[PDB]
Every structure is written in C-alpha cells, then in structure tokens.
Write a protein that binds this DNA or RNA. Structure first.
Ligand SMILES: [Zn+2]
Length: 149
DNA sequence: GTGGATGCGTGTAGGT
DNA sequence: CCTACACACATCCACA
C-alpha cells in the first residue's frame, strides 16, 4: 500500500482522495493512480451530472474494511448497490436488507465507519422516523432533492 | 484473547 | 412532538 493522495474541490469544500493502486482507500472532507482518477471523475459527476452518474465507473476500494468480509462490509456494499440517487433508507431497513434485521443500530456504526462517504451513500440512510457535520448530510440530501423537517 | 462498555436505532408508553 | 427505557448487536477498548 504505497499511499497516494489528491484533493478535489467540491460544493462541500475540499475533498482529499487517498488510495493506492489496488483501489481507493478513503474520501475525506477537509473543509496519479487510476482508482483516484476514477473517483475524481465520479465525484465530479455526482456534483454536476447526477443523471449520468450510473455511467461513471466506481473506483476499486482498497481500505482494510474492504479486504475481507465483515457485517460492516456487507452493509456498505448492500447500501451502495441498492439505495441509488435521490432515494433513502432507514438504518433498520438496511440492516435487514444486509441480512441481519436486528442490527439496525450496528448499521449506524457501519455508517460512522464508512471510509468513502458520498461514494458510498451513508447519507441516504435515515431514521425509521423519517428524521435525518450534520450540515453536510443535509446538504447532500438537499442536493438529492429532499424536503426539510 | 475476552468481556464489558458504546453508540449515526427503534418500538412502546406516558406527559405537555 | 418529546424525555424515558428496554433491547438487540457488531465493534472497540482496556486489561490479563
Ligand atoms: Zn492499498
């Protein structure tokens, strides 16, 4: 893992993309490799072309959580593959969806644990009460057309 | 290790 | 709607 970084300007501020050649390791908000370019492209699309987003290639993930099966990995995967743009799901819904229905709260942890936010929409996961750096979650949701309250 | 403590949840229940 | 509470549960953390 000979680490590589790169920072991209976004509506949210400065996103620092870091990963190796075997994939993206992490997307982090502050305020030369392919999985990095793919991710940069993808992120740009998400911000200025959410229509053709499903067209841009998802970068390869190489963060340790993505190096072996873990409930947390199952979740993050399910979440990315199932819940698409503009949609939302509740912790428990995802929990069951991932396999474990009673792991609603664990899923919350999995969300806290996501190393690649925005790419892996952990913002699209809300409370089964409809309830929703909170600013950013709300900004992403607004960007995906959601109401307030 | 193991074992208890932890938290981005949720349904039930009563109170304002 | 809101504080209170009981519970289920993958991780984390400190101690052995
Ligand atoms: Zn790597």
């Amino acid at each position: 893992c000979e680490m590589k970084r790169t920072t991209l300007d976004s509506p949210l501020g400065k996103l620092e993309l870091s990963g190796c050649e075997q994939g993206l390791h992490e997307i982090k908000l502050l305020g030369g490799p392919e999985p990095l370019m793919q991710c940069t492209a993808w992120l740009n699309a998400y911000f200025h072309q959410p229509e053709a987003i499903e067209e841009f290639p998802v970068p390869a993930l190489h963060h340790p959580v993505f190096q072996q099966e873990s409930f947390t990995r199952q979740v993050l995967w399910k979440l990315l593959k199932v819940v698409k743009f503009g949609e939302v799901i509740s912790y428990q819904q995802l929990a069951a969806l991932a396999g474990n229905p009673k792991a609603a709260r664990a899923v919350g942890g999995a969300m806290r644990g996501n190393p690649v936010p925005i790419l892996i929409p952990c913002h699209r996961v809300v409370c089964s009460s409809g309830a929703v750096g909170l600013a950013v979650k709300e900004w992403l949701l607004a960007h995906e057309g959601h109401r307030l309250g």
